[PDB]
Design an enzyme around this catalytic site. Structure first.
Site, short mmCIF file in Angstrom:
data_model
loop_
_atom_site.label_atom_id
_atom_site.label_comp_id
_atom_site.label_asym_id
_atom_site.label_seq_id
_atom_site.Cartn_x
_atom_site.Cartn_y
_atom_site.Cartn_z
CD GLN A 11 -2.93 1.20 2.28
OE1 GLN A 11 -3.80 0.33 2.36
NE2 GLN A 11 -2.81 2.18 3.16
CD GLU A 71 -5.73 -4.67 -0.35
OE1 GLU A 71 -5.31 -3.97 -1.29
OE2 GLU A 71 -6.13 -4.19 0.73
CB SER A 140 5.57 0.48 4.62
OG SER A 140 4.82 -0.71 4.43
CB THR A 145 2.76 -6.55 0.95
OG1 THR A 145 1.55 -7.30 1.12
CG2 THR A 145 3.18 -6.61 -0.52
N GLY A 146 4.96 -4.98 2.35
CA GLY A 146 6.03 -3.99 2.38
C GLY A 146 7.34 -4.48 2.97
CB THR A 179 -1.46 -0.56 9.43
OG1 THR A 179 -1.31 0.53 8.51
CG2 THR A 179 -2.61 -1.46 8.96
CE1 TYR A 224 -0.83 6.39 6.12
CE2 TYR A 224 -2.88 5.29 5.47
CZ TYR A 224 -1.77 5.37 6.30
OH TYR A 224 -1.58 4.46 7.31
CG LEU A 252 20.13 4.49 -9.97
CD1 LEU A 252 19.46 3.14 -10.15
CD2 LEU A 252 19.31 5.37 -9.04
CD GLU A 254 27.61 11.48 -9.63
OE1 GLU A 254 27.31 11.34 -10.84
OE2 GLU A 254 27.67 12.60 -9.08
#
Ligand SMILES: Nc1nc2c(ncn2[C@@H]2O[C@H](COP(=O)(O)OP(=O)(O)OP(=O)(O)O)[C@@H](O)[C@H]2O)c(=O)[nH]1
Ligand SMILES: Nc1ncnc2c1ncn2[C@@H]1O[C@H](COP(=O)(O)OP(=O)(O)CP(=O)(O)O)[C@@H](O)[C@H]1O
Ligand SMILES: Nc1nc2c(ncn2[C@@H]2O[C@H](COP(=O)(O)OP(=O)(O)O)[C@@H](O)[C@H]2O)c(=O)[nH]1
Ligand SMILES: COc1ccc(/C=C/C(=O)c2ccc(OC)c3c2OC(C)(C)C=C3)cc1
Ligand SMILES: [Ca+2]
Ligand SMILES: [Mg+2]
Ligand SMILES: [Mg+2]
Lengths: 437, 54, 428, 334
Positions: A11, A71, A140, A145-146, A179, A224, A252, A254
């Site tokens: 999310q 989800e 997150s 999931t995060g 959460t 949010y 990237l 650098e």
């Protein structure tokens, strides 16, 4: 030109992804349908924006993004949202049931049944690249999931793309917005599994963003959307040099060279100024000196900590707007004499400055006011270990009684991995201590 | 004090300002670890279905 | 995680269950025929959680009605909303369980159980993503207690990876049908400890006392008790039934409320406490809701929260109010009474606000607490059990159905273990 | 009702502070591990500053300043005075001091030791007190810990009758807004044995610490002369007041030291707030010149003055942040 792929997990990753791509489109003048009037090479080119956008013969500019959630609900709002034509459905991957705030469920259980599908769709974007440099990962620390799936993805991306750089944008958990109660567990578990696989990681503490929105945007109870519009500005500042003509942080690799000398200590503190409310009548425009000075105020940082009681290893200043080098050096000279800035003995005391003349773009109808000049400071300070200590203490309190542990074990994980992840964190806290004082 | 590496363009400019000088697991191992937890899950469901059969 | 399958068993299970569907159908704008006559689109966004789509736009409750006696189930069918239920989902025996746990679990209930499971299976196969199951029942009778727990045991065999949720009504000598209720409850708790993820402990003692001491009713009926049950049932399901800040499901609730698998017995609470028909005209302020919901007088289980400590708390505020003020008041209670929340679960209180208020009230608050004070409920049942069991009284009703004395001793032991398990974390 | 925690068992000052707070009926003490506090009376070592100011709906305050150890550790105090431009290399109120490690500024120490040999003058130092440098350096390596070598004040002011040495202790409270409050009552920790000029071996007449003295209690109770009696002695024996001859220099030293560290330690725009009680140790020579010896992080109060000082701490450091249902301090203006 070297292409970058953005991966948005869970999310927090997806909604921040939406906030960023909305902002990128406004910045590069790309419309919601994907048409870019200013672009002259139709269906091709290797410009600076092509790092983030590929092209079709019709003239559509499509993000090099993959959105993944276990989800459907969140990504369904991208599929039906105002930027639906911008993405092709193959980029947007959804599952059936989420990881229920459980690292182990996202990593082991639901992770196994989707990992091969996601890497296949990532390979689909990598094949379109003439010379991919690597990945920007949005997630997150707190969600199942995060935390769980992201760490498995980071394991596999290292195997399939060993030569490529990986950068993290990570949401550090805050009780004001949280959460779940098990977010300290997930955060420590995911950091341990991701530490070897991540080149540079930008932590964003939801507490800091929340309080910035209350203090500086006059928003009573930040949603949010309020947080993400602000987070996207900071992300945009960090990525700007990959999407625009410049000479600082052009690839990237650098980001590692400039900000990360110790490979384990790869968590730069981001500070942003200024944050000004759009519904504020009469605002005196802040100068170069004032906004650079605000980069050393704790109340402007992405993570709350005290840089005075710590040491620096690297410092980047990234300006957007009406800024000239002369004003920057004048500002730096005054700040050095008035503030406690201590570098490590094995590093030069100094700053790497990047200026882009285009002032920051704000989303129309948003909470942020248009400003003449803005700055994002990226500094690798040992002070950020405070965030690790906070998180480790909360972990220790719960784990001592073995609280909630059975949920993880029940998904196939072993109790040993909890103490293994905590020992790595204890080692990381010591690393910062040695470099620190 | 010393302003070095100055590069300019139409978009903007960049420079360094120095104030003071100084004083992986394999694909096989991943598939193994993931399956080891799937075995531990299946043992737990079997011991549940054994207990319920009783 | 969308579809929940509701099962209601026995007299009490069906009576509180009928009230639940009566209350939530009003909140989702469904009439006693199944048609949507509401005004807000927010009513329909998460309707699939409890209702099954039908041709012509008709909505049918995902509800299975179980009893060993046809009496109570005819009362539902002829009742106010009884026409809404799918007629096939009415599964009933003829003999009845005669307030006997053994009859429900082992003899009479075994004969009927497979028929219920055929209806369960038919409902489960429609589901896009089956979230799990919720049961309404009492623990003091024979069907809801005995057969109800037999169902739970069998559902967990066929669907081992789904959430099992119960609304369990606890017996009390203040609202008592038979002397054997402490036997039936102890045997049921033994089953619930092992086979459920979440149990809402609805104590008949507490519901009587709220009606007597607070609601001023001198002789309350079951209808007055069930008014309090259905209002609490509405509040605890609000987050599953409506869109909010959180994407709320049964598993996430379990992960966050249950630190240790056996300690999943929740104290429900409601504010403000209202009697039937008569309305209060003054809306409560946010500080009043917060003070009342945490007050012992509002708890649906007859336990004093000051005798224990809170492991985890879930709170839900309903109505148009300041979300800033909700946050401020919730933090105030925690910081004023810090000793009553365990230090070893940081940030153990979560709060949600839903815009839509329940019928009759402008703003309300519903409390879900995993307190160690719930041990008092289990001790009370244990004391009433032992008083009879030490003399082996009324036991012939159970031995005549094939049960051994050992099974009572085992059930007594497991509940006493649960009590000492709750005591362990009260002092830790 | 406000909440506080106690994490220092040995703290005689803050034991009295905790006692006074509970007695108001508006403060409750919590368990050590409870994070849900307004005030923290913290530990002396490894105080968790990174955990403070992260509790929503709570204003958090602590009785220590993060970074104040720079002023309070002997080795760091020397480094701070020598490096800080505000203090300067040439500091009139601070004795010549050098930092020496055991197996560093040894070559700078020996070159200054030659100046006292070239002019042939008072070449006495403190670590134990010895005249020769080759005897002092052996002591530092014999111990193991880092020691400060400091120029000993050979000609101090001596109280009559008795020919006695002394040191002044000043108590200073820096509040959350960085107001510097000097407590009006100081104390002289006095020697009981006459000062010996040639014999540096005897440690009772040279060191004036309260613990080492316990001759004891001959001239005054517990070897403690207070600010009313000492002012009177100066008036009669020297024709001057304590305010003029000594206290203006003390106010100058305290203000100079704390203004120096202010940008490094200030909690003005921080998520948590800090106050602290400091104990400043002073030395007066024959010509009425005040010298700073050390600064104390956790100072103990004099027995007579516990009742008043600890109420003062509550009044301006605690109750200013947490209000309830004439002043004993002198504010040092900056
Ligand atoms: N800043 C910000 N934080 C978010 C957002 N959404 C969730 N979070 C935070 O992320 C944490 C929860 O993680 P989620 O991303 O919601 O979980 P998930 O990755 O979807 O995984 P599941 O557990 O399967 O739901 C909490 O700390 C939230 O406060 C967002 O849009 N913006
Ligand atoms: N440079 C100097 N010149 C003269 N006397 C000195 C001196 N340094 C220390 N002293 C004397 O030695 C005593 C000890 O002071 P010092 O600061 O070295 O120890 P200490 O840390 O135990 C003081 P406190 O007990 O307040 O913490 C003082 O009372 C002082 O009279
Ligand atoms: N709160 C409430 N309790 C009930 C109701 N009906 C019965 N009970 C209680 O449930 C127990 C008897 O269970 P019952 O459901 O009648 O038996 P069953 O029909 O065999 O399941 C007793 O403890 C009663 O106090 C009701 O409508 N509401
Ligand atoms: C801090 O401890 C916590 C306790 C519970 C949760 C629950 C998260 C949910 O997804 C969820 C699921 C079902 C619900 O109805 C019973 C609720 C529910 O959570 C809220 C806060 C939205 C309220 C009720 C998280 C942490
Ligand atoms: Ca082009
Ligand atoms: Mg999610
Ligand atoms: Mg009955």
């Amino acid at each position: 030109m070297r292409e970058c792929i953005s991966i948005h997990v869970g999310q927090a990753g997806v909604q921040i992804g939406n906030a960023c791509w909305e902002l990128y489109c406004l910045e590069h003048g790309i419309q919601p349908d994907g048409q870019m009037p200013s672009d002259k090479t139709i269906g091709g080119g290797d410009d600076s924006f092509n790092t983030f956008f590929s092209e079709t013969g019709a003239g559509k500019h499509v993000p090099r993004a993959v959105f993944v959630d276990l989800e459907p609900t969140v990504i369904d709002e991208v599929r039906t949202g105002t930027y639906r034509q911008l993405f092709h459905p193959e980029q947007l991957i959804t599952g059936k049931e989420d990881a229920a705030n459980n690292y182990a469920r996202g990593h082991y259980t639901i992770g196994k049944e989707i990992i091969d599908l996601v890497l296949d769709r990532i390979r689909k974007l990598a094949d379109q690249c003439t010379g991919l440099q690597g990945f920007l990962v949005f997630h997150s620390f707190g969600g199942g999931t995060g935390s769980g799936f992201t760490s498995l993805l980071m394991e596999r991306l290292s195997v399939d793309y060993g030569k490529k750089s990986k950068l993290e944008f990570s949401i550090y958990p805050a009780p004001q917005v949280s959460t779940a109660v098990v977010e300290p567990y997930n955060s420590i578990l995911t950091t341990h599994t991701t530490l070897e696989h991540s080149d540079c990681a930008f932590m964003v503490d939801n507490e800091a963003i929340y309080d910035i929105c209350r203090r500086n945007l006059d928003i009573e109870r930040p949603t949010y959307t309020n947080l993400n519009r602000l987070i996207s500005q900071i992300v945009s500042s960090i990525t700007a040099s990959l999407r625009f003509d410049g000479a600082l942080n052009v690839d990237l690799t650098e980001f590692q060279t400039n900000l990360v000398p110790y490979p384990r200590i790869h968590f730069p503190l981001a500070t942003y100024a200024p944050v000004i409310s759009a519904e504020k009548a009469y605002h005196e425009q802040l100068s170069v000196a004032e906004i650079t000075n605000a980069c050393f105020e704790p109340a402007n940082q992405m993570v709350k900590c005290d840089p005075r009681h710590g040491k620096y290893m690297a410092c980047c200043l990234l300006y957007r707007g009406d800024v000239v080098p002369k004003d920057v050096n004048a500002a730096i000279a005054t700040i050095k004499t008035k503030r406690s800035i201590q570098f490590v003995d094995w590093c030069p005391t100094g700053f790497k400055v990047g200026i882009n003349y285009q002032p920051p773009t704000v989303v129309p109808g948003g909470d942020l006011a248009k400003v003449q000049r803005a700055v994002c400071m990226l500094s690798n300070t040992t002070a950020i270990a405070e965030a690790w200590a906070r998180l480790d203490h909360k972990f220790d309190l719960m784990y001592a009684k073995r609280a909630f542990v059975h949920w993880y074990v029940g998904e196939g994980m072993e109790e040993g991995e909890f103490s293994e992840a905590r020992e790595d964190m204890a080692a990381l806290e010591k690393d910062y201590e040695e470099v620190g004082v | 004090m010393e302003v070095i590496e100055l590069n300019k363009c139409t978009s903007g400019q960049s420079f360094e300002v120095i104030l003071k000088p100084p004083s992986d697991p394999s694909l096989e191992e991943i598939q193994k670890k993931l399956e080891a937890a799937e075995e531990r899950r299946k043992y737990q469901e079997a011991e549940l279905l054994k207990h319920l059969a009783e | 995680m969308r579809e929940i399958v509701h099962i209601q068993a026995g007299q009490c299970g069906n009576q509180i269950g009928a009230k639940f569907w009566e209350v939530i159908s009003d909140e989702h704008g469904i009439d006693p025929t199944g048609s949507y006559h509401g005004d807000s689109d927010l009513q329909l966004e998460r309707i699939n959680v409890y209702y099954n789509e039908a041709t012509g736009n008709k909505y049918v409750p995902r509800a299975i009605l179980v009893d060993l006696e046809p009496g109570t189930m005819d009362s539902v069918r002829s009742g106010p909303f009884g026409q809404i239920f799918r007629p096939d989902n009415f599964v009933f025996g003829q003999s009845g369980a005669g307030n006997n746990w053994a009859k429900g679990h082992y003899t009479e209930g075994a004969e009927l159980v497979d028929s219920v499971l055929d209806v369960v299976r038919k409902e489960s196969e429609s589901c896009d993503c089956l979230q799990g199951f919720q049961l309404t029942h009492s623990l003091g009778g024979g069907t809801g207690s005995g057969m109800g727990t037999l169902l739970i045991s069998k559902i967990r065999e066929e669907y081992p990876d789904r959430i099992m949720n119960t609304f369990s009504v606890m017996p009390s000598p203040k609202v008592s049908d038979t002397v054997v209720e402490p036997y039936n409850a102890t045997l049921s708790v033994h089953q619930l400890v092992e086979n459920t993820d979440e149990t809402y402990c609805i104590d008949n003692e507490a519901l009587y006392d709220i009606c007597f001491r607070t609601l001023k009713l001198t002789t309350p009926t079951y209808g007055d008790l069930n008014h309090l049950v259905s209002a609490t049932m509405s509040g605890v399901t609000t987050c599953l039934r409506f869109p909010g800040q959180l994407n709320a499901d049964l598993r996430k609730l379990a992960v966050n409320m249950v630190p240790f698998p056996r300690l999943h017995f929740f104290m429900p609470g409601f504010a403000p406490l209202t009697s039937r028909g008569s309305q209060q005209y003054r809306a409560l302020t946010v500080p009043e809701l917060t003070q009342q919901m945490f007050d012992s007088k509002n708890m649906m289980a007859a336990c004093d929260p000051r005798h224990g400590r809170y492991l985890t708390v879930a709170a839900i505020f309903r109505g148009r109010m300041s979300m800033k003020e909700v946050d401020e008041q919730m933090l105030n209670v925690q910081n004023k009474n810090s000793s009553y929340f365990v230090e070893w679960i940081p940030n153990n209180v979560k709060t949600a606000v839903c815009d839509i208020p329940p019928r009759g009230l402008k703003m309300s608050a519903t409390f879900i607490g995993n307190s160690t004070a719930i041990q008092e409920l289990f001790k009370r049942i244990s004391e009433q059990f032992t008083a009879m069991f030490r003399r082996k009284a009324f036991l012939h009703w159970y031995t005549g159905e094939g049960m051994d004395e050992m099974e009572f001793t085992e059930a007594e032991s497991n509940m006493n273990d649960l009590v000492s398990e709750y005591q362990q974390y009260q002092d830790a | 009702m406000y909440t506080f925690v106690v994490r220092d068992e040995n703290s005689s000052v803050y034991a009295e502070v905790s006692r006074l707070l509970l007695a108001t009926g508006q403060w409750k003490r919590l368990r050590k591990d409870n994070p849900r506090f307004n005030l923290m009376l913290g530990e002396r070592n490894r105080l968790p500053f990174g955990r403070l100011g992260h509790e929503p709906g709570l204003v958090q305050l602590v009785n220590y300043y993060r970074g104040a150890d720079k002023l309070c550790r002997k080795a760091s105090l020397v480094k701070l005075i020598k490096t800080s431009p505000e203090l300067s290399e040439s500091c009139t109120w601070f004795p010549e001091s050098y930092v020496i490690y055991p197996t560093d500024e040894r070559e700078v120490f020996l070159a200054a030791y030659n100046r006292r040999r070239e002019g042939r003058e008072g070449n006495v130092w403190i670590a134990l007190i010895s005249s020769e440098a080759s005897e002092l350096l052996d002591f530092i390596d014999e111990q193991g810990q880092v020691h400060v070598i400091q120029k000993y004040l050979e000609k101090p002011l001596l109280l009559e009758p008795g020919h006695r040495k002394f040191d002044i202790r000043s108590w200073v409270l820096v509040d959350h807004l960085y107001n510097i409050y000097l407590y009006r009552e100081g104390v002289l920790r006095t020697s009981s044995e006459p000062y010996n000029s040639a014999n540096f071996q005897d440690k009772t007449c040279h060191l004036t610490n309260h613990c080492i003295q316990k001759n004891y209690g001959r001239y005054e109770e517990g070897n403690e002369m207070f600010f009313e009696e000492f002012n009177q002695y100066l008036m009669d024996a020297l024709n001057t007041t304590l305010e003029n001859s000594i206290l203006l220099q003390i106010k100058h030293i305290i203000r100079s030291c704390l203004m120096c560290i202010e940008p490094a330690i200030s909690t003005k725009h921080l998520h948590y707030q800090s106050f602290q009680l400091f104990g400043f140790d002073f030395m007066v020579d024959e010509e009425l010149k005040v010298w700073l010896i050390e600064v104390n992080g956790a100072p103990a109060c004099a027995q007579k003055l516990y009742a008043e000082l600890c109420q003062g701490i509550v009044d301006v450091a605690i109750s200013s942040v947490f209000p309830l249902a004439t002043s004993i301090f002198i504010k040092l203006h900056h």
